[PDB]
Amino acid sequence: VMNILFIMFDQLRWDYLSCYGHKTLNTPHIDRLAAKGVRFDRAYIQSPICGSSRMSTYTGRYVHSHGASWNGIPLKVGEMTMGDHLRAAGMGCWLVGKTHMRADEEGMARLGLEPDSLIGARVAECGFDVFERDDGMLPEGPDGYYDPDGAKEYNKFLRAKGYESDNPWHDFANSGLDDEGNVQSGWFLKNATRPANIAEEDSETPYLTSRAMEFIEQQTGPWCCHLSYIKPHWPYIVPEPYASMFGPEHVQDVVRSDSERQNAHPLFKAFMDTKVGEAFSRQEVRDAVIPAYMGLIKQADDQMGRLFKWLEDTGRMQDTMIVLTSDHGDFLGDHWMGEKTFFHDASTRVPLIIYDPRPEADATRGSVCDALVESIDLAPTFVEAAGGKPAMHILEGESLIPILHGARDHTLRDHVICEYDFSASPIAHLNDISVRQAVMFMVADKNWKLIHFEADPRPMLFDLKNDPQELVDLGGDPAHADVIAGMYDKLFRWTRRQSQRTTRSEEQLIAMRTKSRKRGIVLGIYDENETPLELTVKYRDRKARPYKDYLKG
Amino acid sequence: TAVMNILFIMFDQLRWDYLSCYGHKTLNTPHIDRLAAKGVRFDRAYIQSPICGSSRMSTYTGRYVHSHGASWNGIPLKVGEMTMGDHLRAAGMGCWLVGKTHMRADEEGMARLGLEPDSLIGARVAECGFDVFERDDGMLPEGPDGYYDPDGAKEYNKFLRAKGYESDNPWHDFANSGLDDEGNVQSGWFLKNATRPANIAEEDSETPYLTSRAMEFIEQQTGPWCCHLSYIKPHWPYIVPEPYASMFGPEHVQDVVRSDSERQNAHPLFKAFMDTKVGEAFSRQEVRDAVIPAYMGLIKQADDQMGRLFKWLEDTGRMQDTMIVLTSDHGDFLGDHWMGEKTFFHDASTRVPLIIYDPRPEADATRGSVCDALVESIDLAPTFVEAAGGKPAMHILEGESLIPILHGARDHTLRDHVICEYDFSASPIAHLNDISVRQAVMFMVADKNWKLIHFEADPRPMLFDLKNDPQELVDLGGDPAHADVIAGMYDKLFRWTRRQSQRTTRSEEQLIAMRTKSRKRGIVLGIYDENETPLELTVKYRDRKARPYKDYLKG
Ligand SMILES: [Zn+2]
Ligand SMILES: [Zn+2]
């Protein structure tokens, strides 16, 4: 039986792995996975924020199709998920870590789905059976917890080892400590320079790695395990030795220009003119945060070394497909922005490495695929991997198995799509854009990236071949009107897709074309000679009496 | 306050121009005209797909076919798509069916969610949200591969057999067949037999029968109800009892709307719909001569039964408590535009009659008026929710409430265009023309001035100038002088395809409230030190004490 180990890191940039070219951050264990598999050089997520990116990946569907369009927007009860597609192919689907799922409680109540039943618990958890659900943080303020269940098992783990605090996740894993015993919260970016006040083996990435091994040891039958880490997502703080390993001298140059800010499209400027944008535009903030970010990733690589060594030693490596990816990047000050909520590659292009242990993937080991790839491709890839037939009237991406197995070196699509709905975001609050206007679309191929705003008639446009850093907006350039028209055609073609026709497969639709004519539907037939007599056997040669004769009783 | 009841009356395959209040010159429909005189008549109402199943699924969900996915006859409406019944029950009003829906249960989706067909919830999901007084999609065809719909006319056949009628298919032999002088059944499935009177007592035929069931339903009710009274006539078989069978002839039939140039210059996909057996059939004089008088006769019978129904409502004091809606799921070409049936976008199919009577005082001001604003069949669901006293969920429902028009707040809708869609990937015409599932789709966008038709199977659109060519005879889709108008209409279509119709788990109100929620729940971003944000936001993070981690560790 082949198993699938679906590994994801939150907020990990494509260019912060050495196999993707980082100059000072060496990630040999992840690089080694790539050397025995395929590295995807052009992989894009479908929304630049945790919740909606993940919901797209777990459904294999675009945000425009599934409707879970921002953090905390529930995925509706009707939408089937990865776990559903895999279980129909005989493979279990399990969670170790983060999903950012919010149950559609209203929808469940409407259909009488109980959250404590097998079917109900799965719907509430985005199709996963849960080994451990942890979205990876326990923030709190005057109105309470962002997520009361954050770090629930992790805090029990720390308290059992002897840590004591009314928030051990905060005080140890995500804060430093000064000489006088004062907790230095990792929520303050200046404290990113401090080592986390925790034994390194007890911090979050090593913890979740141990949990993955515990799951794998226990689980029989074919399984898919979504191993889903919160780091390098904030708080940006890491234990020794990773804390001391990097400094500002190791940070790659920020990618931005004065002209870019001067000539910023009004909606682009809006995302720069935020607390986070202005913060990460400051040298002292990048000097503190980015070496910590790097340390988090180096720690991840060491834990992948640990995990992969264990799969090898226990003989599981030859029967486990491994996928390694991210839900989105982090601008880290690039383009005068912080966080991730815009369309430049620094956020929307993600690392993606796939290792298929089977001999049919031998021909492509160590190769680099430069074809247009979307995160929604993972679901049909997994179904095919599990020996199933991907239901392509529901799943909108494409299986990557033909690429892995050397049947072709490219996908079939001619463009990728990303979407961002900021109707629920603090930023629409400030610029008071209407809910209906607070949305943007991205369409890109190898040559161009077009950004459409519903709140502004002018698009943004980047020449990806000659401006790969995406610093020069050509959206207002008359010389590019034809190119802009062409990309808009691509976006329009995509919006017209029939993504909601999920209740009949293409084969079933074709079969319906000839069914009714033999079931008595007779149209445009004047007399019995105008259609085959076989079709009207139920209608001809019949006898009856005048109706009055049946009624005179 | 809200109306107590909603009577939602629909006829299948009824044309907008075959009511005398919409201008028909020989077919007098005084009872329906009288209702129009008491209410508002909508002169520009369009359905969202030109075939029974998907038109109805759109109306019952308040959503476009592109949104709900039940895109042709027999394609199940997925579980989880909410229906009119759900919205109305949320507003405290029951929602009941008497007649046709063409609903097909999403059996796989129900199985997946553990939904049982016999539970209250499961039975409602299976029936498109309606509680069922009587489900009858209105016909019992049968061929060598069996019945199209085995449960067609199920209770109706029992009714007829109870009266003494005897047949293995009473619906066919009596209600939808004639009889010659030697006792030979003349099937209404052959159009030549449209000229024959149906071999059945008039009071026992389908439209009076269903009208009687509707009165049975209503008299059994205590408490607020919406009743979908859903007639199959004047949909085929085209045959009717006396006296309707004899009251019209070819001398009463309005001229066919078509031209030789229309045919000569037809777009290849337009031509494909002409080049069918039904198109060819209704292009023949003898066929229209037989069928259209029977079609008229069926409508005249429907008018007489509305008279009966409305008189009963008045006499029992229900007229004061009952909103009445009368409409159609689509028209019938009857040979117009060289086509039969209904599956294309000309007004003869896509524009439907729509009359709404609101008995409340606030609609007194608009009685007898005609509203020429762009209206869609998906407008009914939010209209009903608001009439029932609820707040329509406009993050789910895609149309607009017509209540402001009825109550005289404005005389127009807000939309700048209408949409109609036709997915023929499952249809005979796709087999006949070898069109792929992916390319067997067409879109219609129209306003008061223009109608644009987009085909996925051909790069050239069709375009009609509705203002100067209201009969839609002249295709301007290839005319270079209309390039800008075509671009402009495509912009309207593109705007509509970008709509966020699937974000149904959060309302506008909830999305707005979400904007500030995380701020006081510990999400602190871009903050360098405690002086860069208000102190209360970081109260759980500041001034805390701990020991070096080594000190906690032992064992
Ligand atoms: Zn994330
Ligand atoms: Zn119909």
Short mmCIF file of N, CA and C in Angstrom, two decimals, chain A residues 75-80 104-115 117 119-120 123, chain B residues 77-83 86 89 103 106 108-117 119-129:
data_model
loop_
_atom_site.label_atom_id
_atom_site.label_comp_id
_atom_site.label_asym_id
_atom_site.label_seq_id
_atom_site.Cartn_x
_atom_site.Cartn_y
_atom_site.Cartn_z
N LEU A 75 -16.48 26.98 5.30
CA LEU A 75 -16.69 26.24 4.07
C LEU A 75 -18.06 25.56 4.13
N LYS A 76 -18.92 25.83 3.16
CA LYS A 76 -20.30 25.35 3.22
C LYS A 76 -20.42 23.83 3.23
N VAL A 77 -21.47 23.33 3.89
CA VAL A 77 -21.66 21.90 4.11
C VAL A 77 -21.70 21.06 2.82
N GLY A 78 -22.16 21.65 1.73
CA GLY A 78 -22.25 20.92 0.48
C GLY A 78 -20.93 20.54 -0.16
N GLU A 79 -19.92 21.41 -0.05
CA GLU A 79 -18.63 21.22 -0.71
C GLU A 79 -17.87 20.00 -0.22
N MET A 80 -17.58 19.05 -1.10
CA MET A 80 -16.81 17.90 -0.66
C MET A 80 -15.32 18.21 -0.68
N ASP A 104 -19.34 25.03 9.12
CA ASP A 104 -20.58 25.66 8.69
C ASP A 104 -21.70 25.20 9.62
N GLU A 105 -21.71 25.75 10.84
CA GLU A 105 -22.65 25.32 11.86
C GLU A 105 -24.11 25.48 11.45
N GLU A 106 -24.42 26.59 10.78
CA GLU A 106 -25.76 26.85 10.28
C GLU A 106 -26.20 25.80 9.28
N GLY A 107 -25.32 25.49 8.34
CA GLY A 107 -25.61 24.53 7.29
C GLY A 107 -25.79 23.14 7.86
N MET A 108 -24.96 22.80 8.84
CA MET A 108 -25.05 21.50 9.49
C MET A 108 -26.39 21.36 10.20
N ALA A 109 -26.79 22.41 10.90
CA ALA A 109 -28.06 22.39 11.61
C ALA A 109 -29.22 22.24 10.63
N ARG A 110 -29.15 22.95 9.51
CA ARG A 110 -30.19 22.87 8.48
C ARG A 110 -30.39 21.46 7.96
N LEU A 111 -29.30 20.70 7.84
CA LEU A 111 -29.39 19.35 7.31
C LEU A 111 -29.41 18.29 8.41
N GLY A 112 -29.41 18.72 9.66
CA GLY A 112 -29.49 17.80 10.78
C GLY A 112 -28.22 17.00 10.99
N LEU A 113 -27.09 17.57 10.59
CA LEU A 113 -25.79 16.95 10.81
C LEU A 113 -25.27 17.24 12.22
N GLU A 114 -25.04 16.18 13.00
CA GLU A 114 -24.50 16.30 14.35
C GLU A 114 -22.97 16.30 14.34
N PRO A 115 -22.35 17.26 15.04
CA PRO A 115 -20.88 17.43 15.06
C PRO A 115 -20.16 16.27 15.76
N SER A 117 -21.15 13.00 15.29
CA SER A 117 -21.26 11.78 14.47
C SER A 117 -20.03 11.65 13.58
N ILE A 119 -19.99 11.29 10.26
CA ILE A 119 -20.16 12.16 9.10
C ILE A 119 -20.06 13.64 9.49
N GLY A 120 -20.72 14.00 10.58
CA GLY A 120 -20.68 15.36 11.08
C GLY A 120 -19.31 15.87 11.49
N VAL A 123 -17.34 16.63 8.28
CA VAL A 123 -17.79 17.88 7.68
C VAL A 123 -17.25 19.10 8.43
N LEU B 77 -30.45 18.82 -8.29
CA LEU B 77 -30.03 19.99 -7.54
C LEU B 77 -29.23 19.50 -6.33
N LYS B 78 -27.99 19.96 -6.21
CA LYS B 78 -27.11 19.42 -5.17
C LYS B 78 -27.63 19.69 -3.75
N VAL B 79 -27.32 18.78 -2.83
CA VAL B 79 -27.67 19.01 -1.43
C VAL B 79 -26.92 20.24 -0.96
N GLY B 80 -27.50 21.00 -0.05
CA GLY B 80 -26.79 22.19 0.40
C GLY B 80 -27.21 23.45 -0.33
N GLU B 81 -27.67 23.35 -1.58
CA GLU B 81 -28.31 24.51 -2.20
C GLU B 81 -29.66 24.69 -1.51
N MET B 82 -29.84 25.86 -0.90
CA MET B 82 -31.09 26.22 -0.23
C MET B 82 -32.17 26.57 -1.23
N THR B 83 -33.41 26.35 -0.82
CA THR B 83 -34.52 26.55 -1.71
C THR B 83 -35.52 27.50 -1.09
N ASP B 86 -36.93 26.72 2.29
CA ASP B 86 -36.06 26.97 3.44
C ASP B 86 -36.17 28.41 3.88
N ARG B 89 -39.70 29.10 5.40
CA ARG B 89 -39.90 28.54 6.74
C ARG B 89 -39.10 29.34 7.77
N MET B 103 -38.09 18.32 -10.14
CA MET B 103 -36.98 18.07 -9.23
C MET B 103 -36.44 16.64 -9.36
N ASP B 106 -30.70 14.78 -5.36
CA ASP B 106 -29.27 14.51 -5.35
C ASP B 106 -29.02 13.29 -4.46
N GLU B 108 -26.79 10.85 -4.45
CA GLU B 108 -25.41 10.66 -4.02
C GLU B 108 -25.00 11.62 -2.90
N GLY B 109 -25.42 12.88 -3.02
CA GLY B 109 -25.12 13.89 -2.02
C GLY B 109 -25.83 13.63 -0.71
N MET B 110 -27.08 13.18 -0.79
CA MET B 110 -27.84 12.81 0.41
C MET B 110 -27.16 11.63 1.13
N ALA B 111 -26.75 10.63 0.35
CA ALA B 111 -26.03 9.47 0.88
C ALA B 111 -24.74 9.90 1.59
N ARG B 112 -24.01 10.80 0.95
CA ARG B 112 -22.75 11.30 1.47
C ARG B 112 -22.92 12.00 2.82
N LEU B 113 -24.05 12.68 3.00
CA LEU B 113 -24.30 13.44 4.23
C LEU B 113 -25.19 12.69 5.23
N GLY B 114 -25.54 11.45 4.90
CA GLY B 114 -26.34 10.62 5.80
C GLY B 114 -27.79 11.04 5.86
N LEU B 115 -28.26 11.68 4.80
CA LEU B 115 -29.64 12.17 4.74
C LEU B 115 -30.59 11.06 4.30
N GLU B 116 -31.61 10.81 5.11
CA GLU B 116 -32.60 9.78 4.81
C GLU B 116 -33.83 10.38 4.14
N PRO B 117 -34.25 9.78 3.01
CA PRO B 117 -35.38 10.20 2.17
C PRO B 117 -36.71 10.27 2.91
N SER B 119 -37.00 11.02 6.36
CA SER B 119 -36.98 11.98 7.45
C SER B 119 -37.56 13.30 6.96
N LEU B 120 -37.97 14.17 7.87
CA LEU B 120 -38.56 15.44 7.47
C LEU B 120 -37.58 16.25 6.63
N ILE B 121 -36.35 16.37 7.12
CA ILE B 121 -35.30 17.09 6.41
C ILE B 121 -34.98 16.46 5.07
N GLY B 122 -34.80 15.14 5.06
CA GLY B 122 -34.44 14.43 3.85
C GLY B 122 -35.52 14.52 2.79
N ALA B 123 -36.77 14.41 3.20
CA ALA B 123 -37.87 14.47 2.24
C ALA B 123 -37.95 15.86 1.60
N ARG B 124 -37.66 16.91 2.38
CA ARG B 124 -37.68 18.28 1.87
C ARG B 124 -36.54 18.51 0.89
N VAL B 125 -35.35 18.04 1.24
CA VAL B 125 -34.20 18.13 0.34
C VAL B 125 -34.47 17.41 -0.99
N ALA B 126 -35.11 16.25 -0.90
CA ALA B 126 -35.45 15.47 -2.10
C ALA B 126 -36.47 16.18 -2.98
N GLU B 127 -37.28 17.06 -2.39
CA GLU B 127 -38.37 17.69 -3.13
C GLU B 127 -38.16 19.19 -3.32
N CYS B 128 -36.90 19.60 -3.38
CA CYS B 128 -36.55 21.00 -3.66
C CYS B 128 -37.14 21.96 -2.61
N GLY B 129 -37.17 21.52 -1.35
CA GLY B 129 -37.61 22.36 -0.26
C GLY B 129 -39.10 22.41 0.02
#
